[PDB]
Short mmCIF file of N, CA and C in Angstrom, two decimals:
data_model
loop_
_atom_site.label_atom_id
_atom_site.label_comp_id
_atom_site.label_asym_id
_atom_site.label_seq_id
_atom_site.Cartn_x
_atom_site.Cartn_y
_atom_site.Cartn_z
N UNK A 25 -41.68 -23.58 47.03
CA UNK A 25 -40.88 -24.34 46.07
C UNK A 25 -41.36 -24.06 44.66
N UNK A 26 -40.53 -24.40 43.68
CA UNK A 26 -40.85 -24.10 42.29
C UNK A 26 -41.89 -25.08 41.75
N UNK A 27 -42.88 -24.55 41.04
CA UNK A 27 -43.88 -25.37 40.38
C UNK A 27 -43.43 -25.78 38.99
N UNK A 28 -43.87 -26.96 38.56
CA UNK A 28 -43.90 -27.30 37.14
C UNK A 28 -45.30 -27.57 36.61
N UNK A 29 -46.28 -27.74 37.48
CA UNK A 29 -47.66 -28.06 37.13
C UNK A 29 -48.46 -26.76 37.19
N UNK A 30 -48.94 -26.30 36.04
CA UNK A 30 -49.63 -25.01 36.04
C UNK A 30 -50.96 -25.09 36.78
N UNK A 31 -51.64 -26.24 36.73
CA UNK A 31 -52.87 -26.40 37.50
C UNK A 31 -52.60 -26.22 38.99
N UNK A 32 -51.54 -26.85 39.50
CA UNK A 32 -51.19 -26.67 40.90
C UNK A 32 -50.85 -25.22 41.19
N UNK A 33 -50.23 -24.55 40.22
CA UNK A 33 -49.81 -23.17 40.42
C UNK A 33 -51.01 -22.25 40.57
N UNK A 34 -51.95 -22.30 39.62
CA UNK A 34 -53.13 -21.44 39.70
C UNK A 34 -53.90 -21.70 40.99
N UNK A 35 -54.04 -22.96 41.36
CA UNK A 35 -54.73 -23.30 42.60
C UNK A 35 -54.08 -22.61 43.78
N UNK A 36 -52.74 -22.62 43.83
CA UNK A 36 -52.06 -21.97 44.94
C UNK A 36 -52.23 -20.46 44.88
N UNK A 37 -52.13 -19.88 43.68
CA UNK A 37 -52.30 -18.45 43.54
C UNK A 37 -53.71 -18.01 43.91
N UNK A 38 -54.73 -18.71 43.41
CA UNK A 38 -56.11 -18.36 43.74
C UNK A 38 -56.32 -18.36 45.26
N UNK A 39 -55.83 -19.39 45.94
CA UNK A 39 -56.00 -19.49 47.39
C UNK A 39 -55.36 -18.30 48.09
N UNK A 40 -54.12 -17.97 47.70
CA UNK A 40 -53.40 -16.88 48.35
C UNK A 40 -54.16 -15.56 48.21
N UNK A 41 -54.79 -15.35 47.06
CA UNK A 41 -55.54 -14.11 46.82
C UNK A 41 -56.85 -14.08 47.60
N UNK A 42 -57.50 -15.23 47.76
CA UNK A 42 -58.66 -15.29 48.63
C UNK A 42 -58.28 -15.16 50.10
N UNK A 43 -57.12 -15.67 50.49
CA UNK A 43 -56.72 -15.59 51.89
C UNK A 43 -56.37 -14.16 52.31
N UNK A 44 -55.80 -13.38 51.40
CA UNK A 44 -55.46 -11.98 51.67
C UNK A 44 -55.61 -11.21 50.38
N UNK A 45 -56.85 -10.86 50.01
CA UNK A 45 -57.04 -10.05 48.80
C UNK A 45 -56.42 -8.67 48.92
N UNK A 46 -56.26 -8.16 50.14
CA UNK A 46 -55.61 -6.86 50.31
C UNK A 46 -54.11 -6.93 50.08
N UNK A 47 -53.57 -8.08 49.71
CA UNK A 47 -52.18 -8.22 49.33
C UNK A 47 -52.10 -8.87 47.95
N UNK A 48 -51.14 -8.45 47.14
CA UNK A 48 -50.91 -9.10 45.84
C UNK A 48 -50.10 -10.38 46.01
N UNK A 49 -49.93 -11.08 44.90
CA UNK A 49 -48.96 -12.15 44.80
C UNK A 49 -47.99 -11.81 43.67
N UNK A 50 -46.88 -12.53 43.63
CA UNK A 50 -45.86 -12.35 42.61
C UNK A 50 -45.70 -13.66 41.84
N UNK A 51 -45.67 -13.57 40.51
CA UNK A 51 -45.44 -14.72 39.64
C UNK A 51 -44.18 -14.51 38.82
N UNK A 52 -43.32 -15.52 38.85
CA UNK A 52 -41.98 -15.50 38.29
C UNK A 52 -41.82 -16.70 37.37
N UNK A 53 -41.41 -16.44 36.13
CA UNK A 53 -41.23 -17.49 35.14
C UNK A 53 -39.76 -17.91 35.12
N UNK A 54 -39.50 -19.18 35.41
CA UNK A 54 -38.15 -19.72 35.45
C UNK A 54 -37.94 -20.72 34.31
N UNK A 55 -36.70 -20.80 33.84
CA UNK A 55 -36.23 -21.89 32.98
C UNK A 55 -34.75 -22.09 33.25
N UNK A 56 -34.29 -23.32 33.02
CA UNK A 56 -32.90 -23.65 33.32
C UNK A 56 -31.92 -22.95 32.39
N UNK A 57 -32.36 -22.53 31.21
CA UNK A 57 -31.52 -21.77 30.30
C UNK A 57 -31.53 -20.28 30.58
N UNK A 58 -32.32 -19.82 31.54
CA UNK A 58 -32.53 -18.39 31.74
C UNK A 58 -31.43 -17.84 32.64
N UNK A 59 -30.50 -17.08 32.04
CA UNK A 59 -29.36 -16.56 32.79
C UNK A 59 -29.83 -15.55 33.84
N UNK A 60 -30.71 -14.64 33.45
CA UNK A 60 -31.17 -13.63 34.41
C UNK A 60 -31.97 -14.27 35.54
N UNK A 61 -32.70 -15.36 35.24
CA UNK A 61 -33.37 -16.06 36.34
C UNK A 61 -32.34 -16.55 37.36
N UNK A 62 -31.22 -17.09 36.89
CA UNK A 62 -30.25 -17.61 37.84
C UNK A 62 -29.54 -16.47 38.58
N UNK A 63 -29.33 -15.33 37.92
CA UNK A 63 -28.80 -14.18 38.63
C UNK A 63 -29.79 -13.70 39.69
N UNK A 64 -31.07 -13.59 39.35
CA UNK A 64 -32.04 -13.17 40.36
C UNK A 64 -31.99 -14.10 41.55
N UNK A 65 -32.00 -15.40 41.30
CA UNK A 65 -31.99 -16.35 42.40
C UNK A 65 -30.74 -16.19 43.26
N UNK A 66 -29.61 -15.81 42.67
CA UNK A 66 -28.36 -15.83 43.41
C UNK A 66 -28.04 -14.51 44.10
N UNK A 67 -28.54 -13.39 43.57
CA UNK A 67 -28.14 -12.09 44.06
C UNK A 67 -29.28 -11.22 44.55
N UNK A 68 -30.54 -11.61 44.35
CA UNK A 68 -31.62 -10.68 44.66
C UNK A 68 -32.77 -11.31 45.43
N UNK A 69 -33.33 -12.39 44.91
CA UNK A 69 -34.45 -13.06 45.55
C UNK A 69 -34.11 -13.67 46.89
N UNK A 70 -32.83 -13.94 47.15
CA UNK A 70 -32.43 -14.56 48.41
C UNK A 70 -31.98 -13.52 49.43
N UNK A 71 -32.14 -12.23 49.11
CA UNK A 71 -31.57 -11.17 49.95
C UNK A 71 -32.55 -10.76 51.06
N UNK A 72 -32.05 -10.54 52.27
CA UNK A 72 -32.96 -10.19 53.38
C UNK A 72 -33.80 -8.95 53.13
N UNK A 73 -33.29 -7.94 52.41
CA UNK A 73 -34.10 -6.75 52.21
C UNK A 73 -35.27 -7.01 51.28
N UNK A 74 -35.17 -8.04 50.43
CA UNK A 74 -36.31 -8.39 49.60
C UNK A 74 -37.35 -9.14 50.41
N UNK A 75 -36.92 -10.09 51.25
CA UNK A 75 -37.86 -10.83 52.07
C UNK A 75 -38.56 -9.93 53.05
N UNK A 76 -37.96 -8.79 53.39
CA UNK A 76 -38.60 -7.85 54.30
C UNK A 76 -39.69 -7.06 53.58
N UNK A 77 -39.43 -6.72 52.31
CA UNK A 77 -40.34 -5.89 51.54
C UNK A 77 -41.43 -6.71 50.85
N UNK A 78 -41.11 -7.92 50.43
CA UNK A 78 -42.04 -8.79 49.71
C UNK A 78 -42.34 -10.01 50.57
N UNK A 79 -43.60 -10.38 50.65
CA UNK A 79 -43.98 -11.60 51.34
C UNK A 79 -43.63 -12.77 50.43
N UNK A 80 -42.52 -13.45 50.73
CA UNK A 80 -42.05 -14.50 49.83
C UNK A 80 -42.89 -15.77 49.92
N UNK A 81 -43.67 -15.93 50.99
CA UNK A 81 -44.71 -16.96 50.96
C UNK A 81 -45.75 -16.66 49.89
N UNK A 82 -45.77 -15.45 49.35
CA UNK A 82 -46.68 -15.08 48.27
C UNK A 82 -45.95 -14.93 46.94
N UNK A 83 -44.78 -15.54 46.83
CA UNK A 83 -43.93 -15.50 45.64
C UNK A 83 -44.00 -16.86 44.98
N UNK A 84 -44.58 -16.92 43.78
CA UNK A 84 -44.77 -18.18 43.08
C UNK A 84 -43.86 -18.25 41.87
N UNK A 85 -43.21 -19.41 41.69
CA UNK A 85 -42.30 -19.66 40.59
C UNK A 85 -42.80 -20.83 39.76
N UNK A 86 -42.83 -20.66 38.45
CA UNK A 86 -43.21 -21.74 37.56
C UNK A 86 -42.03 -22.07 36.65
N UNK A 87 -41.67 -23.35 36.60
CA UNK A 87 -40.58 -23.84 35.77
C UNK A 87 -41.14 -24.29 34.43
N UNK A 88 -40.78 -23.59 33.36
CA UNK A 88 -41.26 -23.92 32.01
C UNK A 88 -40.15 -24.54 31.18
N UNK A 89 -39.07 -25.01 31.83
CA UNK A 89 -37.99 -25.66 31.11
C UNK A 89 -38.54 -26.70 30.14
N UNK A 90 -39.53 -27.47 30.58
CA UNK A 90 -40.02 -28.58 29.78
C UNK A 90 -40.78 -28.09 28.56
N UNK A 91 -41.36 -26.90 28.63
CA UNK A 91 -42.04 -26.31 27.47
C UNK A 91 -43.23 -27.15 27.02
N UNK A 92 -43.95 -27.76 27.96
CA UNK A 92 -45.17 -28.46 27.62
C UNK A 92 -46.24 -27.45 27.18
N UNK A 93 -47.32 -27.93 26.55
CA UNK A 93 -48.34 -26.97 26.08
C UNK A 93 -48.91 -26.10 27.18
N UNK A 94 -49.12 -26.65 28.38
CA UNK A 94 -49.60 -25.83 29.48
C UNK A 94 -48.61 -24.71 29.81
N UNK A 95 -47.31 -25.00 29.76
CA UNK A 95 -46.34 -23.92 29.93
C UNK A 95 -46.48 -22.89 28.82
N UNK A 96 -46.53 -23.35 27.57
CA UNK A 96 -46.71 -22.44 26.45
C UNK A 96 -47.98 -21.62 26.61
N UNK A 97 -49.04 -22.23 27.11
CA UNK A 97 -50.30 -21.51 27.25
C UNK A 97 -50.18 -20.43 28.31
N UNK A 98 -49.52 -20.75 29.42
CA UNK A 98 -49.37 -19.77 30.50
C UNK A 98 -48.50 -18.60 30.06
N UNK A 99 -47.40 -18.89 29.36
CA UNK A 99 -46.55 -17.82 28.86
C UNK A 99 -47.34 -16.85 27.98
N UNK A 100 -48.14 -17.39 27.06
CA UNK A 100 -48.90 -16.53 26.16
C UNK A 100 -49.94 -15.73 26.92
N UNK A 101 -50.55 -16.32 27.95
CA UNK A 101 -51.54 -15.56 28.70
C UNK A 101 -50.89 -14.41 29.46
N UNK A 102 -49.60 -14.54 29.79
CA UNK A 102 -48.84 -13.45 30.39
C UNK A 102 -48.06 -12.64 29.37
N UNK A 103 -48.30 -12.85 28.07
CA UNK A 103 -47.68 -12.06 27.03
C UNK A 103 -46.20 -12.29 26.88
N UNK A 104 -45.71 -13.49 27.21
CA UNK A 104 -44.30 -13.83 27.11
C UNK A 104 -44.06 -14.89 26.04
N UNK A 105 -42.87 -14.86 25.45
CA UNK A 105 -42.40 -15.98 24.65
C UNK A 105 -41.66 -17.00 25.51
N UNK A 106 -40.88 -16.52 26.48
CA UNK A 106 -40.21 -17.34 27.46
C UNK A 106 -39.82 -16.49 28.65
N UNK A 107 -39.10 -17.06 29.61
CA UNK A 107 -38.52 -16.25 30.68
C UNK A 107 -37.40 -15.38 30.13
N UNK A 108 -37.01 -14.31 30.84
CA UNK A 108 -37.48 -13.91 32.17
C UNK A 108 -38.85 -13.24 32.19
N UNK A 109 -39.41 -13.09 33.38
CA UNK A 109 -40.72 -12.50 33.53
C UNK A 109 -41.23 -12.64 34.94
N UNK A 110 -41.31 -11.51 35.63
CA UNK A 110 -41.77 -11.42 37.01
C UNK A 110 -42.94 -10.46 37.02
N UNK A 111 -44.10 -10.93 37.49
CA UNK A 111 -45.29 -10.10 37.51
C UNK A 111 -45.79 -9.90 38.93
N UNK A 112 -46.28 -8.70 39.22
CA UNK A 112 -47.15 -8.49 40.36
C UNK A 112 -48.58 -8.75 39.89
N UNK A 113 -49.26 -9.70 40.55
CA UNK A 113 -50.61 -10.13 40.21
C UNK A 113 -51.53 -9.83 41.39
N UNK A 114 -52.61 -9.12 41.12
CA UNK A 114 -53.45 -8.56 42.17
C UNK A 114 -54.77 -9.32 42.26
N UNK A 115 -55.38 -9.25 43.44
CA UNK A 115 -56.63 -9.96 43.65
C UNK A 115 -57.76 -9.42 42.78
N UNK A 116 -57.59 -8.25 42.15
CA UNK A 116 -58.62 -7.71 41.25
C UNK A 116 -58.67 -8.45 39.93
N UNK A 117 -57.65 -9.25 39.62
CA UNK A 117 -57.42 -9.78 38.29
C UNK A 117 -56.28 -9.10 37.56
N UNK A 118 -56.04 -7.82 37.84
CA UNK A 118 -55.03 -7.05 37.10
C UNK A 118 -53.62 -7.51 37.45
N UNK A 119 -52.69 -7.31 36.49
CA UNK A 119 -51.28 -7.62 36.66
C UNK A 119 -50.43 -6.45 36.19
N UNK A 120 -49.26 -6.32 36.81
CA UNK A 120 -48.26 -5.32 36.45
C UNK A 120 -47.56 -5.70 35.16
N UNK A 121 -46.93 -4.69 34.55
CA UNK A 121 -45.90 -4.95 33.56
C UNK A 121 -44.82 -5.82 34.19
N UNK A 122 -44.17 -6.69 33.42
CA UNK A 122 -43.16 -7.57 34.00
C UNK A 122 -41.80 -6.91 34.07
N UNK A 123 -41.09 -7.23 35.14
CA UNK A 123 -39.64 -7.13 35.14
C UNK A 123 -39.09 -8.18 34.19
N UNK A 124 -38.18 -7.77 33.32
CA UNK A 124 -37.73 -8.61 32.22
C UNK A 124 -36.22 -8.85 32.24
N UNK A 125 -35.61 -8.79 33.42
CA UNK A 125 -34.20 -9.12 33.52
C UNK A 125 -33.70 -8.91 34.93
N UNK A 126 -32.40 -9.09 35.08
CA UNK A 126 -31.82 -9.08 36.41
C UNK A 126 -31.70 -7.66 36.95
N UNK A 127 -32.22 -7.45 38.17
CA UNK A 127 -32.01 -6.23 38.95
C UNK A 127 -31.60 -6.59 40.37
N UNK A 128 -30.81 -5.71 40.97
CA UNK A 128 -30.44 -5.83 42.37
C UNK A 128 -31.65 -5.54 43.25
N UNK A 129 -31.45 -5.75 44.55
CA UNK A 129 -32.58 -5.78 45.49
C UNK A 129 -33.31 -4.45 45.52
N UNK A 130 -32.57 -3.34 45.53
CA UNK A 130 -33.21 -2.04 45.68
C UNK A 130 -34.16 -1.75 44.52
N UNK A 131 -33.78 -2.13 43.30
CA UNK A 131 -34.66 -1.91 42.16
C UNK A 131 -35.79 -2.92 42.12
N UNK A 132 -35.52 -4.16 42.51
CA UNK A 132 -36.61 -5.11 42.66
C UNK A 132 -37.66 -4.56 43.61
N UNK A 133 -37.22 -4.11 44.78
CA UNK A 133 -38.16 -3.60 45.78
C UNK A 133 -38.89 -2.39 45.23
N UNK A 134 -38.16 -1.49 44.57
CA UNK A 134 -38.82 -0.31 44.01
C UNK A 134 -39.87 -0.73 43.01
N UNK A 135 -39.57 -1.73 42.21
CA UNK A 135 -40.52 -2.22 41.24
C UNK A 135 -41.74 -2.81 41.93
N UNK A 136 -41.52 -3.62 42.96
CA UNK A 136 -42.65 -4.18 43.69
C UNK A 136 -43.51 -3.09 44.32
N UNK A 137 -42.88 -2.17 45.05
CA UNK A 137 -43.67 -1.17 45.78
C UNK A 137 -44.47 -0.30 44.83
N UNK A 138 -43.88 0.06 43.69
CA UNK A 138 -44.55 0.93 42.73
C UNK A 138 -45.67 0.19 41.99
N UNK A 139 -45.68 -1.14 42.02
CA UNK A 139 -46.69 -1.93 41.33
C UNK A 139 -47.68 -2.57 42.30
N UNK A 140 -47.76 -2.06 43.53
CA UNK A 140 -48.65 -2.47 44.63
C UNK A 140 -47.94 -3.50 45.48
#
């Protein structure tokens, strides 16, 4: 489910990386004004070929609609002003360049596979 509490989010991400460091996690920045976020949700993230390629139990979403300081802080730490923004985040600490808009499943998957 979508997070709004960044403390809860990091806790979940840290655990997932300790549980399977040989697998990355994915972090996705959502807001209710984000058109590409809603396209991703409707045409790509819900598609069976994505769930086959990406472990969606390892897919974390943070809702920054409220724009509280913790949201602002997290955006800046990921080099964003706002959504969209989808990162591959690895157990090493390193993160991929973000996907910054709507793509269909095949390009999403290509982006994931090429970024670990």
